[PDB]
Nucleic acid binder design. Sequence first.
RNA 1: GGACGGCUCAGUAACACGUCGGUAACCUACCCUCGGGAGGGGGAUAACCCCGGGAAACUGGGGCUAAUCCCCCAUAGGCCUGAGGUACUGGAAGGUCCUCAGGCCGAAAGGGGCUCUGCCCGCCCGAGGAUGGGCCGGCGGCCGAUUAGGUAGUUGGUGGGGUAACGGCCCACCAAGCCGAAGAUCGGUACGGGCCAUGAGAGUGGGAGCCCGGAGAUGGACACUGAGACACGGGUCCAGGCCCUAC
RNA 2: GCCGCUAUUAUUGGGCCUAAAGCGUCCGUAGCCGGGCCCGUAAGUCCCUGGCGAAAUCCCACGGCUCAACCGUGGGGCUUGCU
RNA 3: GGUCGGGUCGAGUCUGGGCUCCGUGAGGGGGGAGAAGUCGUAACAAGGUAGCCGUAGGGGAACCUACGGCUCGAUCACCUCC
Lengths: 126, 241, 111, 178, 144
Amino acid sequence: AIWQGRSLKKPSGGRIILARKKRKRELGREPAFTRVGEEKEKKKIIRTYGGNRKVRLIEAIYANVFENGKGRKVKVLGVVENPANRQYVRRDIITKGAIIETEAGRAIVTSRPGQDGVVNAVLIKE
Amino acid sequence: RKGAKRHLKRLAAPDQWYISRKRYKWAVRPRPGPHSMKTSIPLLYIVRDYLGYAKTAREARKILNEGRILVDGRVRRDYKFPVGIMDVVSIPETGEHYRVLPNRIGKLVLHPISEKEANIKPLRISNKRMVKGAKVQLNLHDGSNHLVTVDDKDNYRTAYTVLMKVPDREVIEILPFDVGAYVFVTRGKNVARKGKIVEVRRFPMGWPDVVTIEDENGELFDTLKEYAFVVGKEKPEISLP
Amino acid sequence: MREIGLKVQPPAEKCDDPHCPWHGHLRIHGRYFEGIVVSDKGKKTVVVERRHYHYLKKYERYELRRSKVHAHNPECIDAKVGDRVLVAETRPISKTKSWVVVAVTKRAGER
Amino acid sequence: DPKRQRKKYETPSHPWIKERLDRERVIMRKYALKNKKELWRHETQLKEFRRRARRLLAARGKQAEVERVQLLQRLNRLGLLPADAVLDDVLSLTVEDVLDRRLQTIVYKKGLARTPRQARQLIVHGHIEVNGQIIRSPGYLVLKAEEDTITYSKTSPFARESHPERMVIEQAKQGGEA
Amino acid sequence: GKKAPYGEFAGRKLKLKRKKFRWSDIRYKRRVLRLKEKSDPLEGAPQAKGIVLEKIAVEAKQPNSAMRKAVRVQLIKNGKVVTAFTPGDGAINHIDEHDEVIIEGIGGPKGGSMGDIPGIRYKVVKVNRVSLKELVKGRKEKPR
RNA sequence: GGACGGCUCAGUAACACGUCGGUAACCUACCCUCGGGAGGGGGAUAACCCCGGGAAACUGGGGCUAAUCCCCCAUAGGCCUGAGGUACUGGAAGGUCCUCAGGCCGAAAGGGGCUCUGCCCGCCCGAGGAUGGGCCGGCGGCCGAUUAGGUAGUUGGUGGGGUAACGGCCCACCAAGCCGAAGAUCGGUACGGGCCAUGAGAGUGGGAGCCCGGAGAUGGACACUGAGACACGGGUCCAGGCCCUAC
RNA sequence: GCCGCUAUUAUUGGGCCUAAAGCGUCCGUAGCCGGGCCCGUAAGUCCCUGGCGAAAUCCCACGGCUCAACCGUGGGGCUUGCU
RNA sequence: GGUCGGGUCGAGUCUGGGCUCCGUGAGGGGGGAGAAGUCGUAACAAGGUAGCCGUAGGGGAACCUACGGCUCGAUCACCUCC
Ligand SMILES: [Mg+2]
Ligand SMILES: [Mg+2]
Ligand SMILES: [Mg+2]
Ligand SMILES: [Mg+2]
Ligand SMILES: [Mg+2]
Ligand SMILES: [Mg+2]
Ligand SMILES: [Mg+2]
Ligand SMILES: [Mg+2]
Ligand SMILES: [Mg+2]
Ligand SMILES: [Mg+2]
């Protein structure tokens, strides 16, 4: 989805007729589907408003996992339990609220790999 | 539409410039700089209109590029440079110094002064960051920044004033915002008015705090704390009007 | 317990969403008013009504003008239809919601 | 939606009132006016004075006192009222007083012109000075302080006392009502 | 009785009723619905140009006896035929067919007909870029 | 640098405009202040030279060369997450700062000129400001009931994605909300205002010209580059029309 | 063509037996109007004060172009106001 | 950069269904003026059948008839209020 402006409907239900064309600054971008890769972690770089930078991850491998202030790079295996979508656990797609099977076990993501380009996760105690 | 403004029409200009709004179409658009547009005027207007050392902008630009006008001890060669409240405009070749201060009408004027006071600039502190190195950055109303340490971080507070020796930038005479402090207003209705502080009210949310001030003739008036500029402890000590 | 900028009593229980000013990370800024709740159907969403009088220069008279606002209602403050709530402005929470309930004076009875 | 410079004279509500016509015909012959426009201009001057005076009667202080003082000192300066005057006296004033403060009329007086029509020609051809300044506008309202400084121009043949028309004008030294 | 809403908090209904009966005002209605603009062949103009189709004459109402001269005129901006009265004494002879003619309003009370001419709303003013008054008084002979 | 200025008022009954406020939910080249840094390598290619092609528009191949051009490496720095400390400001901390962890992204021109051992104009990073914008909200300003029900991502929520940034902006899954006779929806007309005309005033009317804002650049749709454009004197396609042509 | 004329849109400030005009009559929902005293609140309302409502435009004085128009200095007002 | 595809914002192009809009325009309807005309004489005086409302039917046409109402009806004969 491209245009992230206003909606064409009032809360009343009435129609809006756009008084202006769509500006470059109110667009979006095709989403990152941070899937699990076999290897060669894949990422792209986005030039953004202001000349700023976003790192968009497309294939993640490692998933820095955290417990109580201690981290380690622990080699993602797969995805389980995405509350955002079930098609995501099928396609093995990572997001912020996802659960990932890993070395050292299950971990709940805390990062936005489409934005920050890294997968950071938290060990679930069981 | 598609971007920023590089022009200014002389009618759409600030209300505090002494500009002769209908004589021409255009005015100098000030550069971004120390102060704001609401508390500044460009050096071209100072050199050409106020002091009258030039009838023309070409002459004024020649002067400024020769380097005959200082603003707080520094040569300023740009004609769009903002000159703001409590700023010292010096001409050594003529031995003159002026303090840019506001009028009671609300407009900016040049108050003549001498060298001693001309090496002084009072700065309202206006904010206080904690910066890397665990150092304290005072963020001052001329958009300036001064670094101090966690030892006197408490001697330095936001609405206070700092006298500054400007071609070197050495703090002298911190003046705190307290009761009895001599104050000079800078904006509002009670603009070029001065006196001693009496009271401060807080007003819960983002509503600005307000100060009650007592003039020399005993009258008693309110304004905003942000518009209350401290110039002294009991006497203005900076030769205001 | 935190002390959001307008002095009024916080709730008793402390468990909420992040869109609560006291127990979450939501902030409030700008304007605040008291109003009456007229709907409490939506989850964490009420409708608050003001009633100001508008002067007509010509006819030298006044007319009522109702204004709804569509505030957020955290479960700690489960304001119901009738209650005189205090509401404050914040960031957008939804298409229509840019306000949040902070405090109540309950009303079991109305007129 | 901009300024649009407006006339400084008001025309009458009806163009063909016999009373107004007679009155204005008399005034125009007495004061030697080219235009009803000119007359109405001075009438409008008066009207504005009167309206200000009215408002300031029915006004309150700290402003509308300033304007009272300003009105009275303006009219003093113009020579329409004495210094001990009041808004009541404003309302007593007349268009004839205004027209008497015209330059054409003061030059018909000050024994300078012998006729208001010749006064007009003197002014327009450049033979009258007011405070050293040539004025060519006969409708110029003279200030009570400039009145005693009215004189022929230095670069005027009428300033030579040997001039024939100067000799006639001073053969008839007259003034008073004009 | 005492009129409608006189209360301090009745401005709404008061405004409403005044609007309701402004619509009984016919001037307001014409202005606001733009009826003249919809039914005007001159399309909201003070003048218009037309081609003379024919020269005719019209009988004065009842008491007056005369044949007022006129012309049927085809207007260019819309192609519409209107009849226009030719003031003057030999104006209809100074005017010829296929001639371009300028078309004013005749005056008349509601932008309408004038005097003993029952149903004529328009005047001729210029004929082939020459004023009919001058043609009639002899001066400024006609081009074509 | 060309995104300003300049032009026009089609569209738009809308947070477009006015005004009060907010952004602790965001971007900002030029400018100011402060604090720091400028290390080590490498490369290409115009101009020029040889030859051209093509009706033009335009354009090819080979040779040669530089840079404040381009690339790389490291160091600084930036972003995310987790833990805890509570030094800062604020009305209030998902903020700043301190310590530690795991990571990803990752600068720079010590260039040029002089009276050259110093000065001037400059490069990069960070903190703030300023400037200019984005977005949110309260209030406010036409007609029609011979337009009465409207809305289906529609109202909200949970979780996300995306965005500079909040947001049903978009998505998946949950619910049934939202607007409305104080007139919704639909239709009509209309750039908004400051202002202007008129009138004793109350009021009625207008909102081309100057300023402020907005929108648009044959109609429609989409992108590149850049701090900033979906770009009046830049790009691409469709529709429609026109011009040159060696068709 | 707009305002005025027009108290022919009427809040100020119009009329409805016979001139245009009282629903055929009643009942009642919203709305509007609402008896008297006491207490409270202080939402409207009033006062005072802080911050805003750009400049130009409007009024006034004073100055400069011969006066004026125009321009500048200053005072006031204007913006429906909002806070 | 091409060529294959797979996704997207997507104008447009063909078409079928509705809904209005516009330019026209046969043929029927009434309306308004005017001209003198044609048939009558409905109405105003008790207008020569008093007039008018409502409903219904009928009639070249104004109109007529019926049922209920009104006086915005004249006259003379009663009682009453004045
Ligand atoms: Mg590197
Ligand atoms: Mg339009
Ligand atoms: Mg064109
Ligand atoms: Mg009427
Ligand atoms: Mg009447
Ligand atoms: Mg103003
Ligand atoms: Mg009959
Ligand atoms: Mg009969
Ligand atoms: Mg009969
Ligand atoms: Mg029968």
